Write a protein that binds this ligand. Structure first.
Ligand SMILES: *[C@@H]1O[C@H](CO)[C@@H](O[C@@H]2O[C@H](CO)[C@@H](O)[C@H](O)[C@H]2NC(C)=O)[C@H](O)[C@H]1NC(C)=O
Lengths: 48, 48
């Protein structure tokens, strides 16, 4: 995920958050890593 | 695979069946899952 979510834009479904992946930012944690995932989500549909 | 083969279209080779991935349908099995992989296979080539 560090390579595919932070150093790129992934198309893999539900791999870099929920929605359409735009970008991610890492944060360190005591014995691990926290990813902040920024996604695009559509809203307010109409029928045509 | 449930995320990437069923909830979307994958470009990963051989991850969602043999051929060019179109779509997949899940089925429940006892203690497991069965994937029905729908693929696109070209046929009847000519040379040019
Ligand atoms: C396209 O042309 C090639 C030859 O350039 C065909 O390959 C030949 O196929 C025949 C019959 O199977 C063999 O006897 C030859 O040995 C093959 N040639 C070579 C050099 O391998 C090929 O069959 C053609 N493709 C189509 C779809 O007709």
């Amino acid at each position: 995920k560090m390579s595919e979510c932070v150093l790129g834009q992934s198309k893999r479904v539900d791999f870099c958050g929920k929605g359409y992946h735009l970008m991610s930012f890492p944060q360190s944690a005591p014995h691990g890593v926290v990813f902040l995932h920024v996604t695009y989500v559509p809203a307010q549909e109409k029928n045509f």
